[PDB]
Write a protein that binds this ligand. Structure first.
Ligand code: GTP
Ligand code: MG
Lengths: 1122, 437
């Protein structure tokens, strides 16, 4: 925002006040419009400075007119107040009028205010501040009154007297006017005449208010806060020789008031404020004989730093800083020593915030002496690292903020030579914090302090270089500070060992898991800039931390060890040398005892068992990916075991960390099998290959589900050299699970994982034409495609919902991974029928009603269609599909959004091979329950039907396909109601208006019979309603079908459920009102009356007669009891 | 001699305890204030009723009980009740927050703050006793303070006092009395948790007692007072063996040897007769063979099952009042010549009979009537397995959806607890089927 680009709108809104002050709806609209326009500049209202005056004068020529009604004046004052909250009063009041002709017009307006009118509080607020901006006039209030003895019988009261009676009344109110009363007295008693006239009276009133008021009675607390604020403002904006005489009685009364013990945060803050206001009245202002009251003031202000709230701690720190700046240089040392006591071992973390704030306030003025450098600094080094856990919450944010504030105030508290001794401990602190700090406020707080230090002083090692990179915006993302900027800072030798030490000490022992993972990932990269230091000093450290009793510390140390080992292996892989060159025998000896020291302490149980398993699996993966020298050693046999047990106890892991555990275990198994299970180049161990495979295969039949789910992915992660002659068995074992058996009905995750495992195995072994038990060949490629397609019709619906859909997802990602592979090896294997079936299935799963599975299906379809290297052979209407989905438009498509998917999927009906499946899939969305999906699908279907409604051939083929879909899903509860609703919608829209010309069309003649057979003996209410609607829509077709529909509608009118009886008549009324040719005008006034008068929800025996009577009118044979 | 301590947790538990103590005071003649005019050995000593009442200096008979609850509402009625002078103020323990029908809360969150106080109170109460037998805990399975806290206290009592029995008097919930849908979820958890810390367990089917009150007692809508009185009558008929120096079941360790031949199988079936209404005070008369033939009726049992199919493992009859051994023998011969029954031939236990020559007692002004003789049959049977087949079934109905399960995991326990609990249920069912053959 560079300028106010809403001047005309605001001007019009302000001008409309004179013709919107008599409205209640328009008034609120204009207010809400003025508020939202002014709130845009709440973060930078200075841009509105050039406009302030004109808008202010506009609002003033409405409240400064004599023909202005109270209501119109109240809206102007509300607007005026809206401009004083955004710009603030201290800056917006300087433009208000201040002429001597504005003293009585403003006091007289202040004397017509209703104190009991809560709706007009903005008016009173704007009144008091205006009256206060008018007390600056450089004249005596006496010159203005003139002659008071002009009214005989009753003398007029003086202006000054009226103002004293206005301030005392507004200083005991409960609205916001009391705050405006605090700003008025500050500019009323601080002038010469008022000082000599009413100062004593106001002081007696205040001392009486704070001598009778309490912090328990509500109005008493209201009287306490206002009096304290008034006293503080008077002592702040008051002369020191007119005030010092009263400083002795004010403190004596405040001491007896007992504020520290009172249970009010505002009262204590105001009390500390008033105590620091009186404290400076005794000393002389300095520009860089100690009365006894100063000691009492200091004793009160040094007890306001241990408060339980920060609002009082900040005030106490400000008071201490303002007092130290006025006292001599001798008492300053004692004050600093007394303030330093807040950082004692027995003091809580709350006392540390106040101490650091006081230290910063003292350093800002330059009062700390050099002798206080070895101590104060020694404390700051700790305050920057304050981060403790007090039960379930964490504390240390405000401590670090105050530490950064103190650091930022040391660039002007000492000379460059005075602070030259601690530029190696403070530069390392600032940098370390700005780099690893958790909170973003502290990080940027440490960034600004370092900038100020390098700007003012400029003695820190590489100040400009560290400031250019680690700037205010660069430290915004925490991830960028740990993995990028950290390495850049460590590039220099002055910020390498300290940062690594701070990371290994505190960050590794942190309570947050994400922070530990980030610290480990940062150490991974930092080890590159210091391999020797990380291999000789950090590795022993982390190794000793893996034997700690702390769980989080053990996990962090294990992660750090794994990351350092991986980094050392990567670094050594460049020079083509073994990883043992970095780690010593003792180091590789301790990496073979981590797991045996955990399993022997039973550290794999409880809530920490999952974390320990994750850490050990990550360590095993990082060690196997480095080709460590543990081949032949029994330690390997241990690692493998720890994996199996995990896959055997996955159900024990929480539901919020089982997928990650399974993935990590599978990755560790994959890294281990392709490293420690190889006998020769290209071969594998016969004993292990046999035992592991037999165990895994026999495990697939365990009735437990999570075990099968884990072992599936385990099989799907084995290398290729271990399946050179065992594929014919692994594939059969995986396919045996993909089948749905009577016992494994609700077992969907097992098959979902088996499909993914088959995908991975097929991808690893590849294609070799001739070798069935070694690779995917033309002998074991058909079975695979048949097993993958048999899991695409998984519509299992249970109490958990449509869980089968999950399996379908695994069928879309698996079938793809196979196809793309064949095209990249032996495209001939991709048969035409199989490819057509896969495409039709993908089309159906992309025309579904769920939004996340439908979106996944469209992406898979586009990926399979946009494959050109080489082009997948046997693609029905390939060119048609390519023209319908150009590559340029696919870059921006919201497939998840039905609006941006249904109109693009409905066009597939034009293709014969897709027309059937696509419609079977779209029926579920056209007859589902989602309203938006129903609307979008119906609109997209009508947009396509409009193009083939006047075509007897296209419309006929569409109706035939719809009826074939209906027949194929006869008596199917998942396709009966949705398809019936779709037919009802299509009939209501009038798409089949051509078949209604002749009589007895082959379409309706069988559609009616199918609907009858579907609704024959049905108790579902939704199904009954759908059938009734279909039979009430099918009446448009003349011939025997019309008479049969009327007989069915009469049969349904007398159903067991009165609700159905009423709904049938309600729908028949609409059907008769729609089609007029169905019934002649000679018996039309006889049907509507019988339907409106007869109560179809009453006795069924009585309604049978009325219903039978409607059979003698419609001309429908009257049924009987069979 | 040896005494006993009864811990009453939950609402139903404290109600049953109050009813039992009222009935005991009415039988022994102890007035509400705690004045036994029949007692002569003041200060202390050894008597038949001393196993459940501690004597003070002023002759006050303080019941040896501990009523604990996580809410002050329920204990307020006891503190302000007619028996306020009977129980000691310290024996009543209250809590500020309840479990809201949750097992994890009562076993972790709220239980961890009150378990220490409960253990301290139990230790203080046991310091006066010279020889304790066990801990008669009273709870149910439809709440979170009756299952969770009960299991948490059993876990600590099995470690503090391992050489002491641990009898229970659970209350099997019903779908008509159910107050929550996660009522089963609590049941399974506490059942799996007290298996190795409980010798004998007594379960009360809510529907069975409801139907008994509707039919026998003749009540339109039986309330919780009507069901708390019958449970007190049952508890008194069962504890008469310990309160009157009965020959059969002299101590608590005999309940495990007579009615618990197998450690895992410890859920006997308890039935009682007769059940006359207050209106029909002198309408019909029942012999010792007409009341012993009424305890072999499914509708007269406390749990709905069909013992005629399965076989019995044990059997203990207890008569209370005017009963001659000849009448008992005649009733046994009648039961042995009329009804067809099966029994485990390889069981290390058999049939036992005991008599207590004491007149029955009923709460004056209540719905029950004073009878001349009473019978109580405690027989372990495989038919109780049916009572489980229902409970477990509901668990499955709530396991396929995992509804309301996250509330239990987000309080302390993990997810493997449910698999362990249902795995413990499968093993129990297999053991029952094996014993039934
Ligand atoms: N027989 C009987 N059953 C009762 C009584 N009070 C409650 N119940 C049953 O006990 C179950 C409710 O448990 P409560 O004891 O009320 O609750 P709680 O165990 O104290 O636990 P929280 O509600 O979690 O504090 C349901 O099955 C009730 O029908 C009672 O006086 N007699
Ligand atoms: Mg309760």
């Amino acid at each position: 925002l560079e300028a106010f680009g809403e001047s005309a709108e605001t001007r019009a809104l302000l001008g409309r006040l004179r013709e919107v002050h008599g409205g209640g709806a328009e008034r609120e609209v204009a207010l809400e419009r003025f508020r939202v326009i002014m709130d845009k500049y709440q973060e930078q209202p200075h841009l509105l400075d050039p406009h302030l005056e004109w808008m202010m004068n506009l609002l003033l020529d409405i409240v400064q007119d004599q023909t202005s009604p109270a209501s119109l004046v109240h809206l102007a004052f509300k607007f005026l107040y809206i401009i004083t909250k955004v710009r603030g009063y201290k800056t917006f009041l300087r433009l208000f009028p201040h002429e001597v002709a504005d003293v009585e017009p403003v006091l007289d307006l202040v004397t017509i205010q209703n104190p009991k009118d809560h709706e007009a509080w903005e008016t009173r607020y704007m009144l008091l501040l205006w009256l206060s901006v008018t007390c600056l006039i450089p004249f005596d209030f006496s010159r203005l009154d003139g002659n008071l003895l002009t009214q005989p019988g009753q003398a007029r009261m003086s202006i000054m007297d009226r103002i004293l009676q206005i301030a005392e009344s507004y200083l005991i109110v409960s609205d916001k006017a009391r705050d405006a009363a605090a700003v008025l007295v500050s500019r009323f008693i601080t002038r010469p005449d008022v000082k000599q006239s009413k100062m004593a009276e106001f002081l007696d009133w205040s001392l009486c208010n704070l001598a009778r008021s309490s912090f328990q009675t509500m109005q008493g607390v209201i009287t306490m806060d206002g009096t304290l604020q008034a006293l503080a403002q008077i002592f702040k904006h008051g002369k020191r020789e007119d005030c010092l005489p009263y400083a002795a009685t004010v403190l004596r009364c405040l001491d007896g008031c007992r504020l520290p013990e009172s249970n009010q945060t505002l009262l204590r803050k105001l009390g500390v404020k008033l105590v620091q206001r009186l404290g400076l009245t005794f000393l002389k202002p300095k520009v860089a004989d100690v009365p006894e009251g100063v000691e009492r003031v200091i004793e009160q202000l040094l007890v306001g730093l241990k408060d339980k709230d920060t609002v009082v701690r900040w005030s106490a720190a400000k008071g201490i800083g303002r007092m130290a700046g006025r006292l001599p240089r001798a008492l300053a040392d004692d004050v600093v020593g007394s303030v330093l006591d807040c950082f004692s071992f027995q003091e809580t973390d709350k006392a540390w915030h106040g101490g650091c704030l006081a230290l910063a306030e003292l350093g800002r003025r330059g009062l700390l002496l050099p002798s206080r450098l070895v101590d104060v600094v020694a404390v700051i080094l700790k305050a920057l690292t304050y981060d403790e856990k007090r039960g379930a919450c964490s504390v240390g944010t405000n401590v670090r903020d105050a530490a950064c504030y103190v650091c930022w105030a040391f660039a002007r508290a000492y000379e460059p030579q005075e602070l030259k001794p601690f530029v190696t401990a403070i530069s390392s602190a600032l940098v370390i914090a700005a780099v690893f700090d958790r909170d973003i406020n502290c990080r940027r707080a440490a960034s600004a302090a370092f900038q100020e230090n390098v700007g003012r002083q400029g003695t820190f090692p590489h100040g400009i270089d560290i400031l250019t990179t680690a700037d205010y915006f660069a430290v915004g993302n925490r991830s960028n500070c740990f993995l990028v900027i950290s390495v850049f800072i460590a590039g220099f030798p002055e910020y390498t060992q300290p940062m690594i030490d701070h990371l290994v000490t505190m960050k590794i022992s942190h309570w947050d898991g994400v922070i530990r993972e980030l610290a480990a990932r940062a150490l991974h990269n930092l080890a590159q800039q210091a391999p020797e230091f990380s291999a000789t000093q950090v590795f022993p450290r982390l190794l000793s931390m893996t034997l700690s009793p702390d769980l989080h510390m053990r996990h962090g140390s294990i992660l750090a060890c794994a990351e350092v080992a991986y980094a050392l292996y990567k670094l050594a892989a460049q020079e083509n040398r073994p990883v043992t060159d970095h780690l010593d025998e003792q180091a590789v000896q301790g990496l073979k005892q981590i797991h045996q020291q955990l399993y022997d302490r039973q550290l794999y149980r409880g809530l920490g068992g999952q974390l320990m398993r994750q850490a050990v699996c990550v360590l095993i993966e990082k060690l196997s990916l480095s080709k460590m020298p543990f081949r032949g050693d029994t330690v390997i046999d241990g690692w493998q075991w720890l994996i199996n047990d995990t896959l055997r106890h996955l159900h024990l892991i929480s539901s919020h960390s089982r997928q990650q555990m399974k993935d990590a275990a599978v990755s560790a198994l994959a890294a281990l099998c392709s490293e420690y299970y190889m006998k020769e180049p290209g071969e594998a161990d016969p004993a292990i290959q046999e035992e592991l495979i037999t165990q895994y295969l026999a495990e697939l039949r365990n009735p437990e589900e999570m075990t099968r789910c884990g072992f599936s992915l385990a099989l799907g992660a084995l290398p290729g050299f271990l399946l050179k002659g065992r594929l014919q068995q692994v594939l059969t074992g995986l396919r045996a699970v993909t089948h749905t058996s009577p016992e494994d009905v609700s077992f969907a995750e097992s098959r979902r994982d088996g499909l993914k495992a088959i995908a991975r195995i097929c991808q690893t072994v590849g294609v070799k034409a001739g070798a069935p038990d070694e690779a995917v060949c033309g002998e074991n490629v058909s079975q695979i495609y048949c097993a993958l397609l048999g899991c695409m019709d998984d519509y299992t619906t249970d109490s958990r919902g449509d869980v089968g859909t999950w399996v379908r997802k695994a069928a879309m990602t698996s079938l793809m991974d196979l196809t793309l592979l064949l095209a990249r090896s032996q495209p001939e294997l991709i048969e035409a029928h199989t490819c057509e079936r896969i495409m039709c299935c993908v089309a159906q799963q992309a025309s579904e009603k769920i939004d996340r599975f439908r979106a996944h299906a469209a992406s898979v379809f586009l990926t399979l269609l946009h494959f050109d290297s080489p082009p997948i052979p046997h693609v029905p209407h390939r060119g048609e599909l390519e023209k319908l989905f150009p590559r340029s438009d696919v870059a921006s498509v919201n497939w998840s959004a039905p609006s941006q998917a249904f109109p693009r999927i409905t066009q597939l009906l034009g293709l014969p091979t897709y027309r059937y499946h696509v419609l079977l899939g779209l029926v579920v969305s056209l007859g589902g329950l989602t309203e938006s999906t129903i609307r979008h699908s119906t609109q997209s279907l009508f947009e396509y039907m409009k193009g083939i409604q006047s075509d007897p051939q296209a419309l006929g083929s569409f109706s035939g396909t719809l009826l074939q879909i209906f027949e194929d899903n006869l008596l199917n509860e998942r396709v009966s109601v949705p398809l019936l609703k779709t037919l009802d919608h299509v009939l209501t829209h009038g798409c089949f208006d051509i078949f209604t010309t002749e009589e007895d069309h082959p379409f309706a003649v069988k559609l009616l019979a199918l609907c009858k057979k579907e609704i024959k003996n049905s108790k579902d209410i939704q199904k009954l309603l759908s059938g009734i609607a279909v039979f009430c829509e099918m009446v448009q077709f003349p011939g025997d079908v019309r008479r049969q529909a009327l007989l069915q509608l009469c049969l349904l009118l007398c159903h067991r459920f009165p609700l159905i009886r009423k709904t049938t008549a309600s729908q028949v009324y609409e059907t008769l009102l729609t089609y007029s040719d169905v019934v002649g005008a000679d018996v039309l006034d006889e049907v509507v009356t019988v339907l409106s008068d007869t109560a179809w929800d009453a006795e069924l025996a009585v309604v049978r007669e009325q219903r039978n009577r409607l059979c003698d009118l419609l001309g429908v044979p009257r049924p009987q009891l069979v | 001699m040896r005494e006993c301590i009864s811990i009453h947790v939950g609402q139903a538990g404290v109600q049953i305890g109050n009813a039992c103590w009222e009935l005991y005071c009415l039988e022994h003649g102890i007035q509400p204030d705690g004045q036994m005019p029949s007692d002569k050995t003041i200060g202390g000593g050894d008597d038949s009723f001393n196993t459940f009442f501690s004597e003070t200096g002023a002759g006050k008979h303080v019941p040896r009980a501990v009523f604990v609850d996580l809410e002050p509402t329920v204990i307020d009625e006891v503190r302000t009740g007619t028996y306020r002078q009977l129980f000691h103020p310290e024996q009543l323990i209250t809590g500020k927050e309840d479990a809201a029908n949750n097992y994890a809360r009562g076993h972790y969150t709220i239980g961890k703050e009150i378990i220490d106080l409960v253990l301290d109170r139990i230790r203080k109460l046991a310091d006066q006793c010279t020889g304790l037998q066990g801990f008669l805990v009273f709870h149910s399975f439809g709440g979170g303070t009756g299952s969770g806290f009960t299991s948490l206290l059993m876990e600590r009592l099995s470690v503090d006092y391992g050489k002491k029995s641990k009898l229970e008097f659970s209350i099997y919930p019903a779908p008509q009395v159910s107050t929550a849908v996660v009522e089963p979820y609590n049941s399974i958890l506490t059942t799996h948790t007290t298996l190795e810390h409980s010798d004998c367990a007594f379960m009360v089917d809510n529907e069975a007692i409801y139907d008994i009150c509707r039919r026998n007692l003749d009540i339109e809508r039986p309330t919780y007072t009507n069901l708390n009185r019958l449970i007190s009558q049952i508890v008194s008929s069962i504890t008469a063996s310990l309160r009157f120096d009965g020959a059969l079941n002299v101590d608590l360790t005999e309940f495990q040897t007579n009615l618990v031949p197998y450690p895992r199988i410890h859920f006997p079936l308890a039935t009682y007769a007769p059940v006359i209404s207050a209106e029909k005070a002198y309408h019909e008369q029942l012999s010792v063979a007409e009341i012993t033939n009424a305890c072999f009726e499914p509708a007269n049992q406390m749990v709905k099952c069909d013992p005629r199919h399965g076989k019995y493992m044990a059997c203990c009859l207890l008569y209370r009042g005017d009963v001659v051994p000849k009448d008992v023998n005649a009733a046994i011969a009648t039961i042995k010549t009329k009804r067809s029954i099966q029994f485990v031939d390889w069981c290390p236990t058999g049939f036992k009979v005991g008599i207590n020559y004491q007149p029955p007692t009923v709460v004056p002004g209540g719905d029950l009537a004073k009878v001349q003789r009473a019978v109580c049959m405690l027989s372990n049977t495989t038919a109780i397995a049916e009572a489980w087949a229902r409970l477990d079934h509901k668990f499955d109905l709530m396991y396929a959806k995992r509804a309301f399960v996250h509330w239990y995991v987000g309080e302390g326990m993990e997810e493997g607890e449910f698999s362990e609990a249902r795995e413990d249920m499968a093993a129990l069912e297999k053991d029952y089927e094996e014993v039934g053959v």
